Design a protein around this ligand. Structure first.
Ligand code: CLA
Ligand code: CLA
Ligand code: CLA
Ligand code: CLA
Ligand code: CLA
Ligand code: CLA
Ligand code: CLA
Ligand code: CLA
Ligand SMILES: CCCCCCCCCCCCCCCC(=O)OC[C@H](COP(=O)(O)OC[C@@H](O)CO)OC(=O)CCCCCCCCCCCCCCC
Ligand SMILES: CC(C)=CCC/C(C)=C\CC/C(C)=C\CC/C(C)=C/CC1=C(C)C(=O)c2ccccc2C1=O
Ligand SMILES: CC(C)=CCC/C(C)=C\CC/C(C)=C\CC/C(C)=C/CC1=C(C)C(=O)c2ccccc2C1=O
Lengths: 75, 223, 148, 75, 773, 39, 48
């Protein structure tokens, strides 16, 4: 969804499960068109992954599998 | 670039050079000095050689690491304060604010530190409901708390806490229902180097989280 | 006209800060009694400030955009009064103080003379501080002391 | 830090006899006192020009502050 | 008795002026290093390590008292000269409410003349000036100054009095000095400091109020200008002039000698609280005050027994028999020994006296905002913030010195033979129970006040405003304090517990908002000097912060006192002294084990205590008392506005800014410490630009302290080894050896700069905020 | 050596006070300059 | 009278908070100290 309009919708780091949140913080950390509270990414990984050529979440998934198995290889 | 740029680059040269002074001083004096010519036999981290010969507090090479850590934090504070204000003055179409007020330090206090705090400290409030910057507001006050908690270990030192823990040990061994529960390791005060290192760790953690909370919530709260 | 730098004779913003200060001064005189020691002080400040902006005008001080005088330090002879003349003045008077104190130590070598100042050996130390290069250069060319 | 840790635990003055490492241990007071002079130099003057600029904005005089263009970096 | 005084102990010479450090044996050998210099200054007023004779010690303390009273008279003269030459007092007497008071200007040099405020410019003082916050002018208007030449006469008389105190010090040390037997008759000195010092002092002050201060304030309140009479409404020859102001009884002092006291019920009244016209105490109540406590102080100086050549005189009490009569079965042998303690130890007396005068200055800070003493004083808000803040800080410093000299007694003047089974001995036998229980109640107060604040930060951040300890959430109502407000508000009328009171104790208890005429450019009446001060959940929380900080400062200083001589760690600590750095890195490390270090730590904890007190006062007075009456329908508009607190359902509720925002640290940061610091950082180019410069300079001094606080001297000494090498390479050799600062003195420099930087930052903030609005 | 003025605080403090007065009157007489004038 | 110590080397005081007979009856018959009780039942009553 960030690839369709890079310039206004913000990168999302991860989604929040905090049981301490009241209703205001649940509405606060939810973006427009979002189903719950998330963290807005400020580390620049979306721009990194765009420039190195990732366009799908399945490529991010095979990247995740490859780094867990590469870590398992180093352990 | 202009003259506030000149002044903060000399502040940067100051910070790097003083941090190098403490560290090269801690490296080259580590084996021995005139106050302590056999210091290498006492290792890297040790408290002191006691109150004699005038007094020997912070005489180890570990201690010049320890004191250079505050200078590195202050140096890198001046560096990222510079980067942040010059870029936020570019990003808000207000480069005349940097070019006028970066030469004097109430401009740094007011037009950088007081002015850009406003979306941070209004992250949560009684009259406006919370937004996404309330976590950076809580992290900002958290880092103020952790940084100031460091100052306890940095300023107050050991033998107060050892005498205080001796009263606490008396209070536990004479309280019924509760002297029947005993420690296995004897409660003592933290060591001298330990009090320095824990005070540094709190100072440093509070420094990083205070600045990270401000540099993210002030820049994300421009709009 | 250097980088981010134009002189005072063609700077618009220096004229704006100039006539803003002179106008705010002239309604500060023009609303008061001229015989009450406030307004004489404001006319002295007005004359002082006219020749302060005129001296920033006539010796090529340099402004651009924000209008305040920006000092160029290279060793340029056009901008010699920015750095080079207060350099020679600082080395003269600070070498005077350092050489006077150093010579005071070399003639006293006594602990009572440091907390209780002997003026008969402190003021001519200051007088030879006022001519310190003639006594300091050939002791650089000779050498000080052998210590490691 | 690990420079100083090298100095306490791993340096031997006999195998390193009169190499460059032993010579900068030999004239250590020159390096420390000259870093002391650089640090005091930069601090006295940077703080003095900054506090000058503070007094001049305090006294209503922005055109009396000391303003030095960084001529070497614009070159 | 009998005033047994020796003749000429010390010849008057110049020979010891050329020898600094004569008074101590290690200093007398000459300066060899630089620590001698600091050892010259730290031992200058320690007379007990200079001479061992307690008599000569007592004479040095006595001549020091005269020299100090001389320096205080020099300071008194200095503000009387400044009020008498370069003030606006000839025009401030006609406009006390629309003219800002000033007695100092900045001369036409370096551009400082923007510091001259043009709201102080009036006739005579036509330059502008520095607005002062001491409230000297309202004091001066209340005691009857209408003219600057009599202010000059007070200034000359204070210089003459400074010269008299210096000649008294030189006479009673060098020419004719008293012995040790003169000092220890504490009965007579108590009898002549109650009846003579306090009793005749406030009796003569009642005489000043009746003859001078009540009629001049009645002329200033009835509407006439500075053209007054200062000499013809006095004394016998214008006795009828006492009848022209407010009817002097029937005739003369004849109804004083005949006993009908009710005809003086016009200038000795018991009316009650504050005057609506001037916002201050009624002057007749002030005169009847100082007379009633004057009388009861002359009764108070008739208590202790003094024997001499007076025949029937000599009935009364010895203090020793009273102290040795109060024994108890819980407390062993009671107060026996405490008379010998308090008649042979100066530090024990100084500990009691610093505790009492610091407590009394804190008492003074409360009661002078609470009852406004001086005309048009409570509406000048920088003076209110400044005198509360001033007397709070002086009070906290003297309480830390009380803990200091109690520990100095316990190091130096403790004798086990005198203190056998008394209260002082058995306190030392269960000092672990006292300090440990004190440690527990400090933990309880800290969790149950600060964790409430942290909880409020958390629940307001998480979007749960109803989960907050606040007045809109979990209410923590101060029901005892609110009940005492209801009792002191309700006790004035008929059929009450004080039946003949017209206007209660103070309006802060819950009765009526009081307002004063003032200009403020071209406005209307406004200017609430004083209002009821309501107590809610935030007041519960801030008062338990205050109980926390008081109790930790007690814990530190009292742990310094009771563990001064010995501990389980160091049993021989009294041999190590009051002021030693440590006993080495052994036993784990013994850093800051001396009782001096507990004074050093209790100084910062006093800083914490008094800073939160003056922060409570600034935000509290600003949020619920101080402000404006609106020109339409007389509505109260405070200095900071009301906050509409968003509730959890969606609606709002109006609270004041202290009631809404002082329940967490984010509101303290934002609405108190970010919002009200806008006039100290925007003050440049104007009359408050110095307070910006003091604000930044005090931030510098506070941060400069932390080099000395967080470091230690072995670093600095091997650094000075490298700098001393650089000096010896160029033949620049001081005979006085460049040393690092000592451990105790580095701690002292750090606490001095921490205290100077924080309190001057806060001073700059308070004055630069309160001059603006 | 004279009494009370040969001491290091008096000699030092009158050096700071005399220096700031001579510097001050140098700022009045040279009209508080920023630089040295060449023209 | 009220405060004795009954072993004066041991750092404790025998006080009516410490040594009143009903306080000793209370503390000494709280379940951790009440005699004749297996440790499980002491834990049981403390837990309840
Ligand atoms: C006779 C006085 C004198 C002289 C000739 C020097 C000379 C020197 N100092 Mg030193 N110093 C002095 C006094 C002096 N100092 C005093 C009083 C202090 C304590 C504040 C120091 C603290 C100091 C440090 C920490 C360092 C030096 C360093 C140096 C060297 C480098 C230049 C510099 O940094 O200036 C700096 C000067 C100061 C920081 C001190 C300020 C100037 C003082 C107050 C002047 C003393 C006035 C004296 C009372 C005059 C007497 C007059 C007489 C006729 C009665 C240089 C050879 C640096 C070095 O090691 O270089 C390699 C170094 O880091 N100095
Ligand atoms: C009004 C402006 C002003 C003010 C208030 C100061 C103030 C100060 N300067 Mg300074 N300076 C200025 C303008 C100013 N400077 C300018 C425009 C220059 C450029 C030329 C310098 C260059 C300069 C140097 C090189 C040094 C200072 C130093 C100092 C400090 C102590 C000096 C002293 O007299 O103590 C008493 C005197 C002595 C203790 C001995 C005299 C030493 C003099 C200052 C240096 C002479 C040595 C040698 C001949 C030349 C050095 C070689 C150099 C080219 C690297 C002091 C706080 C010293 C410092 O900062 O410490 C680190 C120092 O070493 N300044
Ligand atoms: C604002 C707070 C503050 C200030 C001003 C300083 C200042 C200084 N530190 Mg420092 N430091 C600090 C906090 C501070 N520190 C803290 C919290 C720590 C951790 C404990 C350290 C640890 C530290 C170490 C370990 C060292 C220093 C050193 C120094 C000196 C550095 C020389 C210099 O920069 O230029 C010049 C001086 C200044 C800018 C100070 C202002 C002096 C003004 C001009 C005097 C005003 C005069 C007036 C009459 C009063 C200088 C005096 C180093 C040193 O000794 O260098 C030679 C050294 O090794 N610091
Ligand atoms: C190190 C930092 C620094 C530097 C480089 C300067 C530099 C300057 N300041 Mg400044 N200032 C500083 C720190 C500094 N300041 C600080 C920290 C403060 C706060 C206390 C101030 C507060 C301040 C004010 C309020 C003002 C200045 C002013 C000035 C300027 C004029 C000085 C002058 O030329 O006099 C004149 C010099 C001469 C006429 C040369 C003749 C010298 C004679 C021969 C000897 C006098 C030297 C001395 C007294 C030694 C005695 C010698 C003996 C033989 C008698 C100058 C550019 C003035 C200004 O207008 O700014 C533009 C002014 O208004 N400063
Ligand atoms: C009624 C007589 C009388 C009066 C008016 C005083 C007044 C005073 N005494 Mg004194 N005293 C007295 C009787 C008196 N004393 C007797 C009879 C004895 C011996 C038994 C003493 C022994 C004594 C000692 C040891 C000291 C005093 C001190 C003081 C001064 C306290 C400072 C003060 O109160 O602030 C206000 C100041 C004024 C109103 C002026 C004060 C002026 C203290 C002092 O400061 O010494 C000078 C102190 O050292 N007194
Ligand atoms: C009636 C008040 C009173 C009196 C008579 C004394 C008397 C004494 N005290 Mg004491 N004390 C007091 C109140 C008092 N104190 C208070 C209110 C505190 C809490 C702060 C203390 C805490 C204290 C400690 C920790 C110690 C004493 C010690 C002493 C003894 C020697 C002190 C000395 O030699 O002078 C020397 C004075 C100095 C070296 C001055 C220090 C520097 C000052 C504080 C900085 C001033 C800054 C200024 C206020 C503001 C800035 C201005 C600046 C910018 C120019 C002496 C018997 C010492 C002792 O050994 O007891 C036997 C000691 O250990 N006192
Ligand atoms: C902001 C920094 C800071 C903090 C938090 C403290 C905290 C404390 N100080 Mg300290 N102190 C400080 C600065 C600080 N100080 C400095 C700078 C100095 C140097 C002068 C000192 C010197 C000092 C001395 C000499 C003494 C203290 C004492 C105390 C304790 C007081 C008891 C109390 O308040 O109850 C409760 C605790 C708090 C209010 C701290 C915050 C607790 C939070 C709100 C609760 C956290 C919830 C939960 C535990 C978190 C779990 C999360 C999980 C992941 C771990 C307390 C723990 C005194 C003491 O020991 O008495 C008991 C003691 O005598 N301090
Ligand atoms: C630990 C702290 C410490 C302390 C307290 C001192 C203290 C002192 N040091 Mg020092 N020092 C230190 C550390 C320390 N140092 C370190 C770390 C170093 C580096 C290694 C040095 C290196 C050092 C040197 C090289 C010297 C000192 C000197 C001094 C003494 C200066 C006396 C003074 O200021 O009056 C100042 C007196 C004058 C300026 C005399 C002139 C006054 C005239 C005659 C009066 C008439 C003028 C008239 C009023 C008109 C005024 C106009 C004017 C412009 C002329 C003083 C006792 C100096 C000394 O020995 O004494 C002279 C000295 O030369 N120190
Ligand atoms: C408190 C009521 C009270 O004073 O009780 C009375 C008791 C002492 O009373 P006494 O009868 O011993 O008093 C006689 C003299 O000591 C006092 O004049 O105080 C204590 O128990 C010690 C204080 C412990 C404090 C515990 C906390
Ligand atoms: C296995 C494990 C770690 C379990 C967790 C164990 C559990 C329940 C809580 C963790 C302990 C905690 C939270 C505190 C104790 C630390 C302590 C002895 C502090 C007092 C002390 C202070 C305050 C100083 O400033 C200071 C400065 C210089 C030297 C020494 C000291 C010093 O001693
Ligand atoms: C008229 C007048 C004012 C004359 C001034 C008289 C003259 C000429 C020079 C006087 C020298 C001066 C002004 C200061 C020296 C102080 C000094 C050696 C500090 C280094 C040091 C620092 C930085 C710490 O943090 C620290 C922490 C814990 C223990 C020790 C230390 C320690 O040692």
């Amino acid at each position: 969804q960030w690839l369709t309009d890079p310039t206004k919708v913000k990168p999302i780091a991860h989604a929040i499960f905090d049981p301490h949140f009241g209703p205001g913080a649940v509405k606060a950390f939810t973006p427009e068109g979002g189903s719950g509270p998330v963290n807005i990414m400020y580390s620049g990984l979306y721009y990194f992954w765009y420039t190195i050529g990732i366009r799908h979440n399945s490529e991010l998934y095979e990247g995740a599998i490859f780094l867990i198995l590469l870590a398992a290889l180093f352990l | 670039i202009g003259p506030g740029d000149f002044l903060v680059h000399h502040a940067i040269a100051l910070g790097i050079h003083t941090t190098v002074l403490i560290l090269v001083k801690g490296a080259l004096d580590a084996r021995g000095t005139k106050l302590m010519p056999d210091k290498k036999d006492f290792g890297y981290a040790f408290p002191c050689d006691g109150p004699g010969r005038g007094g020997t507090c912070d005489i180890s090479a570990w201690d010049a690491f320890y004191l250079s850590m505050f200078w590195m934090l202050n140096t890198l504070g001046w560096i990222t304060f510079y980067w942040h204000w010059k870029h936020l003055a570019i990003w808000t179409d207000n480069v005349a604010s940097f070019n006028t007020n970066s030469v004097y330090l109430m401009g740094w206090l007011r037009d950088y530190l007081w002015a850009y705090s406003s979306p941070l400290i209004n992250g949560y409030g009684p009259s406006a409901a919370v937004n996404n910057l309330s976590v950076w507001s809580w992290m900002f006050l958290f880092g103020h708390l952790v940084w100031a908690t460091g100052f306890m270990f940095l300023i107050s030192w050991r033998g107060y806490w050892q005498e205080l823990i001796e009263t606490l040990v008396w209070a536990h061994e004479r309280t019924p229902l509760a002297n029947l529960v005993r420690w296995k390791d004897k409660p003592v005060a933290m060591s001298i180097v330990q009090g320095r290192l824990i005070g540094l760790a709190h100072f440093t953690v509070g420094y990083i989280l205070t600045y990270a909370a401000f540099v993210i919530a002030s820049t994300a709260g421009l709009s | 006209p250097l980088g981010n730098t134009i002189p005072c004779s063609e700077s618009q913003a220096f004229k704006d800060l100039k006539d803003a200060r002179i106008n705010g001064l002239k309604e500060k005189i023009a609303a008061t009694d001229p015989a009450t020691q406030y307004a004489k002080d404001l006319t002295a400040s007005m004359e002082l400030w006219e020749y302060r902006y005129a001296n920033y005008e006539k010796n090529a001080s340099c402004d651009k955009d924000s209008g305040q005088p920006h000092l160029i330090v290279d060793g340029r002879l056009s901008h010699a009064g920015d750095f080079i003349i207060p350099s020679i003045l600082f080395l003269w008077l600070a070498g005077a103080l350092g050489w006077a104190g150093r010579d005071y130590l070399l003639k006293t070598q006594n602990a009572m003379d440091e907390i209780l100042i002997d003026f008969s050996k402190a003021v001519p130390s200051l007088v030879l501080g006022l001519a310190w290069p003639l006594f300091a250069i050939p002791q650089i060319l000779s050498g000080a002391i052998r210590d490691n | 830090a690990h420079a100083a840790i090298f100095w306490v635990r791993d340096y031997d003055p006999e195998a390193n006899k009169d190499n460059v490492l032993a010579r900068v241990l030999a004239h250590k007071e020159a390096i420390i006192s000259h870093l002391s002079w650089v640090s005091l130099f930069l601090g006295f003057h940077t703080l003095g020009l900054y506090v000058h600029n503070d007094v001049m904005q305090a006294f209503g005089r922005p055109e009396d502050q000391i303003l030095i263009e960084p001529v070497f970096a614009q070159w | 008795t009998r005033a047994t005084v020796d003749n000429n102990p010390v010849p008057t010479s110049i020979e010891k002026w050329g020898k600094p450090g004569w008074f101590e044996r290690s200093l007398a050998r000459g300066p060899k290093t630089t620590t001698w210099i600091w050892d010259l200054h730290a031992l200058a007023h320690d007379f007990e390590v200079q001479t061992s004779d307690r008599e000569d010690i007592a004479r040095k303390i006595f001549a020091a008292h005269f020299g100090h009273l001389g320096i205080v008279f020099i300071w008194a003269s200095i503000f009387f000269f400044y009020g008498a030459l370069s003030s606006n007092y000839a025009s401030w007497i006609d406009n006390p409410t629309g003219l800002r008071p000033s007695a100092q200007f900045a001369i036409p040099v370096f551009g400082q003349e923007v510091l001259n405020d043009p709201a102080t410019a009036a006739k005579g003082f036509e330059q502008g000036g520095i607005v002062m916050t001491s409230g000297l002018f309202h004091l001066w208007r209340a005691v009857g100054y209408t003219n600057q030449t009599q202010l000059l006469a007070t200034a000359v008389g204070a210089l003459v009095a400074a010269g008299l105190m210096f000649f008294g010090g030189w006479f009673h040390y060098h020419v004719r000095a008293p012995k040790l037997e003169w000092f220890q008759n504490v009965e007579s000195m108590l009898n002549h400091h109650l009846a003579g010092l306090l009793g005749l002092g406030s009796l003569a002050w009642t005489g000043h109020l009746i003859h001078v201060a009540l009629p001049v304030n009645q002329m200033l309140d009835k509407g006439m200008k500075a053209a007054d009479i200062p000499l013809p409404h006095e004394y016998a020859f214008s006795t009828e002039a006492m009848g022209n102001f407010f009817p002097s009884f029937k005739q003369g002092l004849l109804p004083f000698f005949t006993g009908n006291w009710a005809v003086y019920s016009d200038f000795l009244t018991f009316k009650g609280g504050l005057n609506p016209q001037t916002g201050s105490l009624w002057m007749t109540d002030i005169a009847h005050h100082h007379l009633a406590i004057a009388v009861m102080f002359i009764i108070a100086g008739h208590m202790y027994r003094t024997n001499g050549p007076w025949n029937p005189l000599g009935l009364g009490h010895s203090i020793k028999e009273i102290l040795e009569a109060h024994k108890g079965p819980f407390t062993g042998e009671g107060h026996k020994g405490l008379y010998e303690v308090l008649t042979t130890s100066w530090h024990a007396q100084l500990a009691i006296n610093l505790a009492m005068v610091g407590s009394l200055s804190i008492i003074v800070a409360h009661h002078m905002y609470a009852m406004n003493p001086y005309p048009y004083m409570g509406i000048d808000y920088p003076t209110q913030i400044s005198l509360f803040t001033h007397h709070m800080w002086i009070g906290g410093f003297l309480i830390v010195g009380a803990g200091a000299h109690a520990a100095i007694f316990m190091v130096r003047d403790y004798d086990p033979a005198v203190n056998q089974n008394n209260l002082l001995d058995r306190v030392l036998r269960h000092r672990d129970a006292i300090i440990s229980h004190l440690n527990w109640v400090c933990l309880f107060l800290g969790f149950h006040s600060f964790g409430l604040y942290v909880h409020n930060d958390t629940m307001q951040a998480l979007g749960r405003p109803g989960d907050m300890f606040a007045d809109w959430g979990i209410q923590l109502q101060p029901v005892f304090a609110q009940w005492i407000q209801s009792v002191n508000a309700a006790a004035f009328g008929p059929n009450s517990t004080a039946p003949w009171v017209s206007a209660a104790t103070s309006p802060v208890w819950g009765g009526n908002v009081l307002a004063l005429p003032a200009t403020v450019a071209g406005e209307v009446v406004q200017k609430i000097s004083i209002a009821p001060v309501p107590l809610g959940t935030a007041d519960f929380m801030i008062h338990h912060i205050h109980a926390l900080t008081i109790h930790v400062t007690i814990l530190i200083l009292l742990k310094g006192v009771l563990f001064a001589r010995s501990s389980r760690l160091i049993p021989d600590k009294a041999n190590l002294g009051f002021r030693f750095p440590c006993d080495g890195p052994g036993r784990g490390g013994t850093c800051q084990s001396s009782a001096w270090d507990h004074v050093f730590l209790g100084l910062f904890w006093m800083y914490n205590c008094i800073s939160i007190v003056i922060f409570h006062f600034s935000w509290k007075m600003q949020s619920d008392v101080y402000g404006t009456l609106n020109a339409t329908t007389k509505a109260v508009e405070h200095i900071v506005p009301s906050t509409d607190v968003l509730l959890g359902n969606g609606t709002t509720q109006a609270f004041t800014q202290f009631a809404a925002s002082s329940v967490n640290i984010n509101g303290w940061l934002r609405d108190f410490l970010w919002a009200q610091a806008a006039p100290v950082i925007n003050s440049y180019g104007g009359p408050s630009a110095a307070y910006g410069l003091f604000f930044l300079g005090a931030h510098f001094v506070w941060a400069f302290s932390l080099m000395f606080l967080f470091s230690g001297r072995g670093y600095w000494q091997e650094l000075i080894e490298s700098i001393v090498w650089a000096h010896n390479k160029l033949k620049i050799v001081p005979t006085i050896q460049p040393r690092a600062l000592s451990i105790t003195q580095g701690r002292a420099v750090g606490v001095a700069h921490y205290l100077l930087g924080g309190i001057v930052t806060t001073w700059a903030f308070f004055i630069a905020r309160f001059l603006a609005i | 050596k004279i009494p009370f003025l040969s001491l290091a605080p008096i000699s030092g403090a009158l050096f700071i006070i005399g220096s700031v007065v001579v510097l001050a009157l140098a700022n009045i007489y040279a009209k508080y300059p920023l630089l040295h004038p060449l023209v | 009278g009220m405060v004795s110590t009954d072993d004066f080397q041991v750092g404790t005081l025998l006080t009516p908070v410490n040594n009143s007979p009903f306080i000793k009856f209370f503390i000494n018959n709280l379940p951790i100290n009440r005699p004749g009780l297996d440790p499980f039942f002491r834990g049981l009553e403390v837990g309840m």
